[PDB]
Amino acid sequence: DRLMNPLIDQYLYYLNRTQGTTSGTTNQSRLLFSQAGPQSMSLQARNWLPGPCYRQQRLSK
Amino acid sequence: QGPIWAKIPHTDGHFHPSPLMGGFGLKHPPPQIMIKNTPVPANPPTTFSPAKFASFITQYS
Amino acid sequence: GADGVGNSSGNWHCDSQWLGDRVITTSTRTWALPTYNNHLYKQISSQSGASNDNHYFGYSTPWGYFDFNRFHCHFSPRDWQRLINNNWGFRPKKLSFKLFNIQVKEVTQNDGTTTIANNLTSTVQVFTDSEYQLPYVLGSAHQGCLPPFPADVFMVPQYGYLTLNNGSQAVGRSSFYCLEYFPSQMLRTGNNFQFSYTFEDVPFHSSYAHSQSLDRLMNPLIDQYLYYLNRTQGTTSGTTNQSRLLFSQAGPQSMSLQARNWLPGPCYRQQRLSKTANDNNNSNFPWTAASKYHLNGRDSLVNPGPAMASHKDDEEKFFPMHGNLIFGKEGTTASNAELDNVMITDEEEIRTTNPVATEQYGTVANNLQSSNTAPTTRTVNDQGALPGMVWQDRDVYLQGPIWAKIPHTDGHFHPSPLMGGFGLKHPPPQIMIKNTPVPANPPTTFSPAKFASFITQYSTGQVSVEIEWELQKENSKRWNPEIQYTSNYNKSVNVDFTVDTNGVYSEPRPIGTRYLTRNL
Numbered sequence: 001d002r003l004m005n006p007l008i009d010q011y012l013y014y015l016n017r018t019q020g021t022t023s024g025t026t027n028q029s030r031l032l033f034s035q036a037g038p039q040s041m042s043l044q045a046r047n048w049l050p051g052p053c054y055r056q057q058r059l060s061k
Numbered sequence: 062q063g064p065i066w067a068k069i070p071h072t073d074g075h076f077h078p079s080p081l082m083g084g085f086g087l088k089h090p091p092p093q094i095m096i097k098n099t100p101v102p103a104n105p106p107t108t109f110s111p112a113k114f115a116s117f118i119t120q121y122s
Numbered sequence: 123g124a125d126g127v128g129n130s131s132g133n134w135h136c137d138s139q140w141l142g143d144r145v146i147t148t149s150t151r152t153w154a155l156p157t158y159n160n161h162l163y164k165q166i167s168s169q170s171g172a173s174n175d176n177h178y179f180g181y182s183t184p185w186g187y188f189d190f191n192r193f194h195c196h197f198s199p200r201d202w203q204r205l206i207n208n209n210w211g212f213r214p215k216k217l218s219f220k221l222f223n224i225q226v227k228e229v230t231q232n233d234g235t236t237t238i239a240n241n242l243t244s245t246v247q248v249f250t251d252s253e254y255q256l257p258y259v260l261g262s263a264h265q266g267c268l269p270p271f272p273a274d275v276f277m278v279p280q281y282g283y284l285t286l287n288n289g290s291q292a293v294g295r296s297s298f299y300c301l302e303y304f305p306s307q308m309l310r311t312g313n314n315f316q317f318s319y320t321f322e323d324v325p326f327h328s329s330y331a332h333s334q335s336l337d338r339l340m341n342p343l344i345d346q347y348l349y350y351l352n353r354t355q356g357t358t359s360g361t362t363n364q365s366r367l368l369f370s371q372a373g374p375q376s377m378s379l380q381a382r383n384w385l386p387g388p389c390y391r392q393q394r395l396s397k398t399a400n401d402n403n404n405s406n407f408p409w410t411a412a413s414k415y416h417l418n419g420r421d422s423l424v425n426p427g428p429a430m431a432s433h434k435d436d437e438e439k440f441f442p443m444h445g446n447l448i449f450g451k452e453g454t455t456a457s458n459a460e461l462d463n464v465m466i467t468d469e470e471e472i473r474t475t476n477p478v479a480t481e482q483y484g485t486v487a488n489n490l491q492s493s494n495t496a497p498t499t500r501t502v503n504d505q506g507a508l509p510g511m512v513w514q515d516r517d518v519y520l521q522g523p524i525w526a527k528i529p530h531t532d533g534h535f536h537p538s539p540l541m542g543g544f545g546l547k548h549p550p551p552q553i554m555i556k557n558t559p560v561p562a563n564p565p566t567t568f569s570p571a572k573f574a575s576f577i578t579q580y581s582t583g584q585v586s587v588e589i590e591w592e593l594q595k596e597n598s599k600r601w602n603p604e605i606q607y608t609s610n611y612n613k614s615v616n617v618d619f620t621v622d623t624n625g626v627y628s629e630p631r632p633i634g635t636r637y638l639t640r641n642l
């Protein structure tokens with residue numbers, strides 16, 4: 001997940017707001033998109049996934 | 062001080078393809094020679110900007 | 123070629139592949155041929171006082187003929203797409219004609235049952251008019267071509283020709299032709315016919331449309347150094363200002379006033395018609411108001427006149443009185459069909475080189491203006507040719523004609539088929555076909571009487587036509603995308619260019635050829 005560039009922003013867009021608008025008067029919902037930045041680090045577009053899995057139970061020493 | 066040649070239009074048909082303003086009607090006339098001053102970027106910012114560049118050094122050739 | 127009974131004299135070659143530089147179209151269809159005119163040549167003519175502009179005199183021959191003067195005979199819908207969307211232009215090159223797998227069936231009506239069987243010892247006769255001595259009857263939009271759909275079977279048309287006539291009568295200079303006086307090859311079952319032809323040099327068709335205009339050819343930024351007169355009187359009009367001669371230097375501002383080097387194509391005004399059956403005049407004028415010509419005192423309708431634009435910008439509803447080729451949809455009577463049963467072709471790509479068919483041509487002066495006389499203007503409705511004119515020809519559509527035999531006269535102007543296509547001095551010759559007459563049962567006593575008792579029989583087999591096409595590739599520096607022909611990706615009822623629920627191929631719309639843009 002930490003493979004991209006910390007300095008430059010992506011030119012791709014993702015949706016991050018479904019309702020929360022200028023919430024006060026007549027603001028129920030609105031579709032809002034953001035351009036990925038170093039700030040939206042765990043939200044940026046991705047090219048790869050992690051390896052497979054088979055959950056194990058957690059034990060303490 | 063009159064015109065010299067003229068590019069006969071590339072159509073399906075022509076009659077007597079002589080330039081109406083006078084001169085020599087040419088299928089393939091002396092090609093167009095283009096010229097332009099290569100754009101020189103003025104001073105750039107220390108921070109990266111995706112914005113279209115529009116600050117250039119003024120110059121003539 | 124010479125082989126036997128149980129040995130096919132040919133294979134089914136129907137395919138097309140591309141060479142990037144050229145394309146070869148191979149087509150094979152099944153044909154059937156009846157016995158026309160009962161093995162007889164018949165003198166045909168106009169009805170005794172049935173019509174005047176339709177008088178005629180000619181003959182009906184027992185021969186049939188092969189035809190494929192339609193593009194859909196060779197190109198599939200898909201191929202036509204590739205062709206249209208990719209090439210500046212194209213043309214015919216070579217030709218290969220083949221007849222094979224011939225079978226002669228003879229039929230007998232015994233009681234109330236028609237039985238059909240094999241008459242192996244029977245022949246058929248073929249020959250090709252390569253000396254061009256028989257009246258060329260092709261290139262007249264006649265029917266009987268090869269089926270657009272390969273699986274369809276077709277009936278081989280009958281040969282009939284016309285001659286010089288004086289009303290219902292004929293002149294002494296008329297000509298009677300017997301196709302039996304031509305050497306022909308006779309074929310039994312297992313025999314085949316071969317023929318190769320080579321197209322002459324003929325200019326590529328315009329599979330392009332101009333991105334520039336005749337009047338919009340100059341530079342939008344710079345002014346002309348030439349001067350024109352734009353003011354004859356209107357001066358600082360107040361005191362003592364009657365008239366003064368004033369000239370202006372052409373600028374981007376005086377765009378439709380600048381000096382010009384070229385003119386639009388010729389014209390022959392057509393009447394304007396609307397598809398909306400209420401915009402029009404409540405009168406029947408498809409003959410009394412249509413543009414027509416006359417020869418020998420005989421009126422003939424100028425159907426596809428000079429190449430003119432169908433409509434001006436922002437209309438697309440007004441088509442010229444027969445100012446373009448109209449195709450009939452599948453399954454539609456030949457007599458007075460509905461407007462929603464025909465396909466009218468739009469020639470709106472040649473707007474930049476050609477005058478509008480229904481609109482005028484321009485303005486002409488016709489008086490000596492002065493203080494005594496006011497200047498007069500004349501609306502020009504008919505314009506011959508002019509030194510400096512440039513025009514684009516018509517268009518070819520998937521189902522349009524391909525070639526046309528340029529008449530052998532003393533003179534031609536711009537010998538391009540009015541219906542569209544390639545004008546050829548020597549076009550693909552006519553291939554004739556006919557079932558060799560078989561005498562029925564003869565009498566034991568000699569009869570000088572003309573023989574007229576024959577065995578009834580029809581022939582059938584396959585035919586193959588291979589044509590090579592030279593291509594002109596596209597070389598444009600257009601930045602933005604050009605327009606392409608395409609199918610509607612939307613959820614649809616039936617598939618465009620396809621058979622239906624009970625097996626009938628149908629061509630939805632006409633297909634233009636001009637989708638790519640080139641400059642002037």
Ligand SMILES: Nc1ncnc2c1ncn2[C@H]1C[C@H](O)[C@@H](COP(=O)(O)O)O1
Nearest residue numbers: 074075076077078079080084085086087
């Ligand atoms: N300026 C100019 N250029 C070319 N041809 C000219 C010119 N002036 C007159 N002509 C004549 C000469 C040829 O006989 C004819 C060819 O027309 P075509 O339509 O090419 O068959 O055009």
Ligand SMILES: Nc1ncnc2c1ncn2[C@H]1C[C@H](O)[C@@H](COP(=O)(O)O)O1
Nearest residue numbers: 324325534535536537538543544545546
């Ligand atoms: N389809 C077709 N066939 C032949 N020529 C064409 C055709 N379309 C346009 N032209 C033009 C090309 C030549 O410059 C001119 C020869 O005319 P001519 O009267 O032969 O001197 O005719």
